[PDB]
Structure formats: C-alpha cells, structure tokens
C-alpha cells in the first residue's frame, strides 16, 4: 500500500528511438552491440544516445578536427575495440524520479582491465548513454570525458 | 538562452534536487516498514536434536526431528500505531523540506544567471575606461611629440592606463569564473545569454509590509516545517510512555515431532516410554502482558519527551522570529535598491557633465590631466555601480518573493519578460 | 532603554537559550532512565492456549489457562553501573555547553546593541557631510549667478553631492536593517537607546597576557568541555569490555495454571493423566552467566574504545591550542583598538585643520573646489573611522572578557556605566 | 625556518591529523567486531531454582541445581557476510577521507606560512610610506620656517602622515595576528622565516586544462570517496533483503542437573518419581529457520535501499561536477595571477616614473603637495598589490596541484626551492 | 530521584492576577469565557492577557486609529465571534524552565475551521496569552499577528 | 586478525635516553623519582623530558631571569614539593599512531589537592613528559603552562 506517488510530472521530450529500459540492461545491450559488430559508427548507434551526444558526435565528425579520436574509438579508453564488458549491477529503478545515474563498466580484454564509467540519462520512459567518463589508465586521446574532449 | 530555458535545463538535470527528491521518496516509503509489524507475521522452522545420556542417564540416546509453522498477530498494541503516526509525520516534514529545496534551487539558478550578466557588464565598462584612457594618452603623447607641455602628463596618464589594465585583467578572470559557475550549476555550457535592456526596465513599488507579513506567516515553508516538527514532538511524547498499556498477542502453530530412542539401557523390558513418538499438534492461543513497575523507566522517558517537546516549541518560536526578520530585511532591501537606482542614475548624469566641464577647463588650461582622469574614473565607477544596483534589485525582488513562500516559475516568467537582447559571454570575443 | 534593560529582556524572552536549557534538563533527566534497569523489574502476564492433536496424538484436546507474576533483579552487573556513570558525564558536558550558550547570548546581544549605535553614528555623519556639500553647492551656485567663476565647479560639486546622496541612502538602509536585527534578537521594538558620550569615555590598559592566559587556561568553558569529553572517553573504554565479568540475576515468580483435557480418546479407562490439573508454583531462583569466548567481539570493542579515547585526547589538545590562539588574538586586537583610537583622534584633528587651510587657500585662490571637497570627504571618513574604532574597542573588551571564561552581567554593568544620553533610532525622526 | 622544516614540525605535532588517523584506525579495527559473530560463540551458565508448591501442588518442594556449557555456530547466514563487506567499504572510505585530511593539512600550513610573509611585506611597505611622508613633512616645515609658502601644505601633509600612521598600526596588528595563527597551526614560535627573493622568482605556464581535467577525474580524492560511497550503497541494497534467505545454525551443549524433592506429601509410599535425579546430557543439533511472510518489511527495506542508492549516485554526480568546477576555477585563477604579476610590475614602474615627474613639476611649481602625496600613496599601493599577487600566485599553484589530487611533500620542496633569505617576524625589531 | 533542579532563578515580575496554570488550561478557559459571554472587552479580560498586550490594547483603543480592528474581534481571525474552540493538548509543563510556548487552537464554527495560533508566556508561577498568530484564511483586518497589527 | 598497519613511518628523532614506555607509567615514574629524592634538578631529570623542555629549562637556568620559578618548583603548581601523586590511568596505547596525549595527575598533599595536567609526546618507541599545564589554584609564579611561562 501507500504508493510513493512521485512529484515529478516532467523529465520527458525524447526524440529518437531506444531500447525498452533498465540501466544495466541498456548499457549491456549497447556494449554488446558494439563488440558483436565491427562498425561502431554513430548512425547505427543512434538509439542508445538520445539527443545531445548524437548531435555533438555528428558535428564533431563534420568538423574535420577530431578525426583520430572519432575514428579509433570514441567510447572506450583505448584505441582498440574491447573484448568483453561487464556493467555494474543495479536492481532496476523505482518509479521515475531518477536521473543522471553514473555506472562503472568493467571493460576487460585479454589479461587487461580498464573499468570505465558512463553517465546515464532517463529522457522520458527510457534510458540512454552519456558522457563516458574515460576512467582508466592510458587515456585514448585529448583528455577528460568524451563530452569535454569533443567540446569546442 | 534566456532565463526560462536556463532554469528548465537546470531543473531537468540537477543532482542536488534529485537527491532531495530521492530522500523524500525513501522517507515516504518508510511507511510500509512502519506498518509491517501490525500485519500478520508468518514463519517456518525445522530442527533435529541428538541427545546423549550421562550420569544417571547413562545408556540413553535420543533423536528428535521437529518441524513447525507459526503465525503471530498483535491484537492490541498502541506502540505500533504511534510509531506509524510518527513515520507519517516524518514523511510530511521531509516533503516540506523537499519543497524548500526546490525554492532554493530556483533562487540559486537565478542568482548565478544574473551574476554572469553583471560580470559581463563590469568587464565591458572597464574595457571602455581603458579605451578612453588610451585615447587620452595618445592625444597627450602626440601633443608632446609636437611639443607643448612637459613630460608629467604623459607619466600620469600612462600610470592610470597601467592600473586600468590590471583592473581589466581581474574583471576578465571574474567573468570567466562566473560563467564556469553557471555551467556547473546548470550542467551545460552557454555561449550567449539574454541581456537586460534599459528601455523596458520599469520598476514597481512592492506591497505594504503588513500584507507581506500576513502572507509570509501563513504560507512560509520554514514555519510550516517548524509547526510539523512541534506536532511530531507532541506525538513523540504521546508515544513515549507505552508502558502503562497492556499488550495482547494471538499465536497459532502447526507442529510435527518424531522422537526415537536407542541405547544400551533402552532395550529393557519396559517397552512403554522408550518407543518412537510421532506427535502432531496445532495450537491456537492468546498472550496478555502488562508492565506494572518498570523501575521508573517509563516516567523518565515521558519527562524526557516533555523536555523535547518544550525544546521543539522553542525552535518553532525561533523560526517564526527568523521569518519575520527575513521579511523585514527583504522589504527594506527592495526599498534601498529602488532608491539607489534613481540616485545612481542622477549621479551618472552629473558625473558625465562634470567630466565634460573638466575637459573644457583643461582645454582652457585651468585644470590638469590628473583631474580629468579622476573625473573619468568617477564616471565609470558610477556607471558600474548603477548596473550592479539594477542586477541586485532583480535578485532582491526574487528573494522577497521566496521569503513570502509562494515562489514558482511564474515569477521567473515575470523576470524573463524584461530580457530582450542576447549577448555572448566569450571572454575573447567581447574584448578582441 | 540602556544595555541592562536590553540584556534583561533578551534573557527573559529568548528561544534559543530556552531550547538549550530544555536540552540540558532532558540530558539531566536521562539519569533516571539510566538507573531504571538496576531497580527491581516487576511484571504480570496471563495466557490461554488451546491445543489440538493428531498423528499418534489423535483425539487429544487440551485447554491451558495460566497466570503469572514475575520479579527480576540484577545482583551483580557492572555494565549498568558503567552506563549510569556515562550518563552522569553526558549530563555534565551538557551543563557546560549550556553555560557556553549563556555566554554566547550575552555577547550577541551586546554586539547587536552596539551595531545599532554604530549605524546611527554613521548615518548622522553622512547626513552632516551631505549638508556641508549642499552648503558649498548653494554658495558656488549663487556666486555663478552673480558671475565670478566658470561652470566647472558647479558640475564637480553636484557630482560629489549626488555620490554623497547615494551613500546616505545606503547608510539609512543599513541602520534600518541593524535595528530590525536587534529587535529580532531581543523580541521588542526599541524606539530609543542610550548613546555613547565622549567626556566620560576613558580607556584602561588590559592585564598582562600572562595572567590572562593563566586564568583562561584554568577557567575556559571550551577547555573544560574537552576535558569532560576525554574523561567520558576514558569511562567508555572502561565500560568497553563488559564481557569478561560474569553476570548474576535473581528471579521470583508466582504462577497458577489450570489444564483441562477432552476428546474422543480422552474418555478411556485410564482416568489418571487425563484429568483437570490445578498447578500453583512460587519460584525463587538465581542465574549465573559468564561469556568465555565471544569470538573476539569484546577485544575489538576494547581496541575501538582505545582509539576513540586517543581521538578525544587529540581533540582536547586542539581545543587548548584554539583557546591559546583566541586569548592571544583578543589581547592583540584590544591593543590595536586602544592605539587606533588615539591615532584616529589625531587624524581627525589634523584633517579639520587641513580643511580649514584648504578653505583659506581657495578663498585666496591657490586651490580648487575639488580639493576642498576631497578634504571634506577625508575629514568625514576620519570621523566615521574614529566612531567605528570606539565601538569596536568596546565589543573587543567584551570579547576578551568572554575568552577569559568569566563573563557575566557585571561586565555588562561596567559597559553600561559609560552610556548616558538617549538617542532615537527612528529613521524618519533623524531624517526630517 | 623555511617551509620544509615548518611543514615537518606541523605534520609531526598536529592534533587534528592525529584525530583523523585515530578515527581511521578505529574504523579499520571495526572489521574484527564485524567478523566476530561468524566465529564460534561459546559460553557457560549455572543456575539454582527453588520451587514451592501451591494449590493442588500443596506439600511439594523442589530444588534444582543446573550447569551448562553451550556452543553456537552460524552454518549459513548471508547477512553476516554482507555486514562484513559493508564494514570493509566503510574502512575504505575512512582511509580516503584520511588522505584528504593530509592534503588539507599541507595546504593549510603553506597558506599560513605565506600569509605571515605577506603581512611582513605589507607592514614594511607601510612603514616606508610613513618614512617618505615624514621626510616630506620635515622638508616642507623647514621651508616654511625659513618662509616660502603658506601653511596649507603643512596641514595637508600632516593629515596624510596621521592617516598613514593609523594604517601602520592596523598593519602591525594584522602581522601579529598572522604570526600567532601560524604558531597555533604549527605548535612552535618561529622568530624568523625564509623570505622570498625576486631574482630567482621565475614563473612557469601551467599544463593545458585538458590533461589537468583528465588527471583530476582519474585521481581526485573527493570523487574516489563518492565512488566508494555509491559502491557502499550498492552493497547496502544487496544486504537489504536478508529475509528471503533461510538461516541455519549448529548448537552443542553439555549440561548437568541435580534435582531434589522434599515436603510433607513427598514422604509417601510412591518412592519412585519423588527421588533425587542427577541427569547429564550432551546435545548436538541443527536449527533451520525461514521467513515466508514478514508483513512487507523486507520489501519496504529493499525499496528504501534502492532510493538510498539512487541518492548516493546523485551525490557522486554532484561531486564530479564540483571537481570539474574546482579544476576550471584553479586554472583560471593561476592564469589571472601570472597575468597580474606582469601588469603590476609595469604599473609600479609607471608609478615611480609618475612620482618622479610630479616631484620635478613641484620643484618647477606647476603642481601641489597633494598631488605628490597622491603619487606616493599610489606607488606604495601598487607595490603592496604586486607582493600580494606574488604570494597569491604561489598559493594558487599549490591549490591547483592539490585539486589535481597528487599533492605531497615534493610540491612543498619545489616551492621551498624559491626561498633564500631569512627575515625576522618580530614586530618591534622590524620597526624600532 | 535525581531532581532536575533548573538553573533559572528568574522569570518573574507579574503585576495583574491570572488563572491557576496550565497553557492549554488557560487558553481553553480564555476561549470559553469569550464564547460564553458576549462582551469580550479588555477590562474583564485583564487576568488572561499578561502585562503588555493589555496596555498595548488599551492604548490602541485610546488611539482611535484601529477602531474597526478593535471593535468586531481582535483575538479571532474573523469578524464574528466563534462558536467553539479546542486548544492543542500539552501534557503539563516540567518545572519552570519553559517560556514562549506557541499553541495552535482549532477555532471551529458551523461547518468551518480556521485553526489560529496563540503564544504562551509564563511570568512566574502562571501562564498568560500573547500575540495570537492570526493563522487562518480571510484574516479580520490589518495583517500579520495582533502585535504587529496594532504596533505603531 | 586484520592488523591495523598504521600509516605513519615517522615520529622519531630521539636524542637522550628514557624509560621503557607507557604514558601513565612514565608520568608515575617521573613523579615518584621527584618525590623520593629531593634534588629535582634538571641534570638528573634529563631522560624524562625529551629534547625541548630540557634545553628550554637549561637556557632559562643560564639566563638568570626566572631564578625564583626555577628554584622553587618548575613542574608543580605550588612552591613546595608535593607529597603524593596519582596519574590518570590509560589502558596502554595501541600501535604508534598516537601523539601529544594530555593526562591530568592528582597532586595530593596533606588535606590538599591541585590536579595538574601534563602533556605527553611519543617521539619514537618511548613516552616523554612535556608542558605541564599548571591546572590548579594558587599558581606558583609567572602564568600559564611551564613552556610558555619560561618562553622569552
């Protein structure tokens, strides 16, 4: 009984499509799509990034300044595509009064680990990837997180 | 973006507000934990005990395997209901503090957004002063190169120019810090914001402090929180005794037990009390308890609750006095701001006239370059102070609206209706 | 009213001091709750159990109604005594912090009163400056109307007049804020307060910092609180083990039970074990318990208490260092204030002489109006700084007395003996 | 001594660092208490119960002496392991906050040590200004005694001298307060400290804000603490349920009981069940428990833990935003400091040239003594601001190094390599 | 045992008479007297108000400025005399170290409620009414509580 | 198990000899040595003071300014040698991560008590007396604690 009834009749305005939901679920699905395929290009990855990282990556690609960073790997701390990923668990999310969940994903390769971190944003009834904190040794290129790295 | 879009983005992606909301939801869900002990408590339990004999019980070995299924209910216990009511009151005060947090967020984002504009105005005024002093320096230097006056004027003007340059560096640093702080509180980097136009800036006298005090006392958030805390203390003293009221419980149980005996002495000729027993029993019963002399524990707890209630009442009185002080201070601050706007406008006009007069006198020759430089710095200081007074008056209006306890996005709309032109906050672009 | 009446009204009607006193009284009454478990614990309990049977116990139903009256006492248990001593120490530290709150209240009310007086003085000085500049304006304007000098002087003096007007507005706002703050800290609206006279204001050199430091170390409240906290940590580590000491309890119980049997199988030919039984037992017994291997819990608790005691001792040493810093700072600040009083008196006399000389030079024609206006500004600034230094010296004397640790109403009486003339704090009356 | 020895003495004898280290050690030792309940729990207990008959038990007296030795083990209970992991995470976050405390100590001692030097420089500059104004006073007074100019110059210069004297008193008090604060933070009285030489003071541009942000994000202490807190919240929600998992215990017990009967009715012809019984029994057994319907308590606890985990994640995000703000602010402040150093060097050279020009003009007669006094005070203000900017730049370099998260004694060595000459901080010695 | 022994040898200076004691008791007695009678004039109400509200109301009455406020009802939030009152309970007051206790009284009329608030001040061995916080919709006149309402 | 492993590999630089250890132990030994003998001169008291109070007392003796204070009694709050001392107990000290611990000693004489306070410095594997806080009535001379009493 005594339902929570959250006081947030907001947190919407989502444009593009996405997966069903669940933070660990969507992060794991996005990583699995990246490893299983070999493209990792933004056009195929559009559903998992909602409305701001997609446009930022688009204009960074059209900028012809960050070609190396945007062509080797923009989402992993290295220059090589990982071999396996394990997202930190989170036992679902109560109601909808929750946003900006940072999750650390153990990004494991053959006898190696980097343990990156990624922010996650709700945008309505869904969950989407954001930031990617670039938390690990031997940072790929530029510096900081992806959003600060490609920010003009 | 203007103030509305900045505030909407800040509210959509603020961590502290989300944390306060999560805390409120947790305190709201605590009601189920508080209500749990009143509901039936059902459990299961099985065991297996092996007993070996000793002393006069030599040669006696027993093996007992038991299972049981129990159910318990509290028929009459006021302590649980009082705990539930306490949890309800705690949830209420958490809701109130969440509302106060929301108001604080609105006030903070408005303050930061206007601080950025104030820094931009300060930097632009300082840069204009530097340009004017540079023009004066160039004129004096060219006059000396032709040759009309000694070197003192050049030295004084260039010293003033160096001081203004240092002030400009400081102002640019302050602007950069302010814009970064706005990004931090909002979560986005804004290249340009709506400025404040002077044509449509019209002031309005506030309501008399009487109706202000009435509405503030009726609808303030801090006073409501204090009242809820005092009511919580009253329910705490009501609950604190819980020792003179007898308790009543109802229990039910279904149990099976299988006992087997073995040993050297168990193989005798008795054959009656040393055989396997398979008992299946279901019990339904009631239990009645009543403390009578607890050693003075309940009386001491009650008196402590009385003292805590008195302290809560004192805290509520202090909160009311602080609310009155806040309302009076906000009203006086608005009145000072509206008077100072006109005072600084008149001061700026008079300072510009004085600078023109000093320039004419220097042209005649009755004054000196230090005097005209002083007039210029006074004029620019007056303009800077007028701009700061405007940006402080807007914030003061928002502050009194918040202290009244009825601040929402409509007030932000009223403020935002006065912003028309956009200006860029890039340090390099404004001063190339 | 003067300072004594203000302080008395503040003490009699303050909510924060009342809250601190209520908290102290609650912590004092905690002693009875701590002492309760050592006293006899008496209780009553009755129950009724219905039992149905199956399996090998098929056809057996029992009804058992029981009542009991129990009494328990703890013959030997050092943990309860240690808890009582801990509660005693907590009550002591609460009394100490209540005394500190009293000192803080007296310091705050004195500070607010003298802040109001300083605001009145600043406003009056600014008004006098405005009157002087207005007189200069009128003289220069009438001279130009007759016609002797150019228009530059009028413009410059008008700019100065406008700036002084803005300063007057902000000073009036500050005074109103200060008087409202005093009303908030006291609870009453005071129309007039005793001012400070300059004939009877005589300064006294403070005691040497040596005896000051000695008395402060002996009698400071914060240091005493730290010492009590360290003693509390010592008693906590003494209580920490409580696991190597065997416990002893004494129990008594008067109980009645009535058991009745019924069922299809209970109507057999036995007629011996299936009849109504009425048992009555009054039991007196002793219980002895002794932990031997607690899994290392007691050793870990003892070591944690050792670390906590070390931390408490470190906190006490930090408190002592802060007390020494406070005493040294108060002495140095008092000496600075008493020197600055004389420095500013000499400065204001020199500034008045300089203003007279500049006026004479302007009459001759050597100087200009900007110079005499600057001299006027310097003179009035010196007067304001002297008044502020006086009030700061009085507040500083109270501050050093508080840091010594022996501040009471006698120091308030000593301060109040220097206030003679009453002045009204109404903005409208002081600004006709 | 120089900065290295001052820091070493501060680290060796600081109370607050000792307290933080003791708290961390206590949190580390809490692991043993958390691990205790998993280990075997062994105990002993003896009792003596006397029973007197009543009602149908009239004439029945019993005396029972019992002893028992018990041992209990928890075969399967995930709650204990989860509590152990929670204690582990708490110890980790305490270690992190201890490291942050170390960083804070280093920053604080450096700030105080440089504040002392800044105060010394300010006092020396003010004393030099007083000497220059005194020289001007003496020259003007002797010229008037011979007789060349009116008394206006004497009056104005005397007023300036008095104001400068008041400022000197204030600066001396500030220096004394600063040196006492340094002694408080260190624990020793330092008569002389290494000063700052201007020959070897060479500035260096900082690393680009990108790599700064990268390293700060990877290795900040506050962000690491936030991450550990979020992991602790995750383990808390994992532990939260602990209700759906059945528990299993193993018990053993060696017991002896001696029962003796006596009474008027106990002397009957039965002689079978009314005789002394000496029973010894050693028991081993297993107990299995399983909650099935807890009334919704476990579900509510799990949901509350989910809300708490959401709140902890949001607090982590807020900490990350604060880290970004700190890094950006530190970089901008460093750049402002390095720019302002050059700006103030140029300004002071310009002011010296201007003062020389004004003195030459006064010798010619075009200027007045107020102008040269203004030039002198502008020069000394510029010098004071340059020194303050230098010290602020050094402190800001340490600040950005600390915010990066890799501050240690090597940075203090780098700072100390720029300190060469020793100067005494005695107020009387510097200004006899 | 262990009597509290409060550290407050003060809080005296009472001039006029009053009722026995008890904050809820005196508030209930005051409201019952006002409801039962129809005069509600200050002269008959002297014992219940302490020493300052009495003289403040006397000089306000002699001022002839707040006649409209003072003639209908000064103590209720409305312009009409209430029909029943119910003061919030308080389990007596320990010792004497307690002052300025604000109590909220439910002021109930026919199908209406306003729930005003009144301050309680000790002044010695007694209890007396102060302020009256005017906590209710559609206040009588002026604004705020009575003390600021009638303050010059 | 789970050894604390304190994180301080420092707090050394010991010059002179000293007693085995234990704060209460060394305080009791120092007071017993002073009471049993009658000299109390600093030459024989060198082990119990560390490196700074010893040299401070030496240079105060060579200064010939505090002759009365140093000749009557430097360590007791009186001008006469005490008759018995009882140092506040402390159940040893865990590991070495602990320094500057103050203890209050009851300085009992014939029907008298003053209860002075003394600081303790570890500085190695030992414990040493410092400061002495002169916490008692009728302070001997100068003022404050001994260290700042003889400080120039």
Author numbering:
A (entry chain P3), E (entry chain P2), F (entry chain P1): 19 to 170
B (entry chain C2), C (entry chain C1), D (entry chain C3): 23 to 454
According to the publication:
Tripartite efflux pumps are essential for Gram-negative bacteria to expel a wide range of toxic compounds, including antibiotics, across their dual-membrane cell envelope. Among these systems, the AcrAB–TolC complex of *Escherichia coli* is one of the most thoroughly studied. Structural analysis reveals that YbjP, a previously uncharacterized lipoprotein, binds TolC in a 3:3 stoichiometry, bridging its protomers at the equatorial domain.
Native purification of *Escherichia coli* membranes yielded a stable assembly containing the outer-membrane channel TolC. Cryo-EM analysis resolved the complex at 3.56 Å resolution ([Fig figs1], [Table tbls1]). The inward-bending HTH coiled-coils occlude the periplasmic tunnel, maintaining TolC in a closed conformation—consistent with previous crystal structures ([Fig fig1]). The YbjP globular domain nestles between adjacent TolC equational domains, forming a stable 3:3 complex ([Fig fig1]). YbjP features a globular domain and a structured N-terminal loop stabilized by a Cys36-Cys144 disulfide bond ([Fig fig1]). The N-terminal loop of YbjP adopts an extended conformation parallel to the first α-helix of TolC’s α-helical barrel, forming substantial intermolecular interfaces. Buried surface area (BSA) analysis reveals 787 Å² of contact with the primary TolC protomer (green in [Fig fig1]), and 1037.4 Å² with the adjacent protomer (light green), suggesting asymmetric binding energetics. The N-terminal density extends to Cys19, which corresponds to the predicted signal peptide cleavage site, positioning the lipoprotein at the periplasmic face of the outer membrane. In the closed conformation, the coiled-coil helices bundle tightly, leaving a ∼4 Å diameter sealed pore.
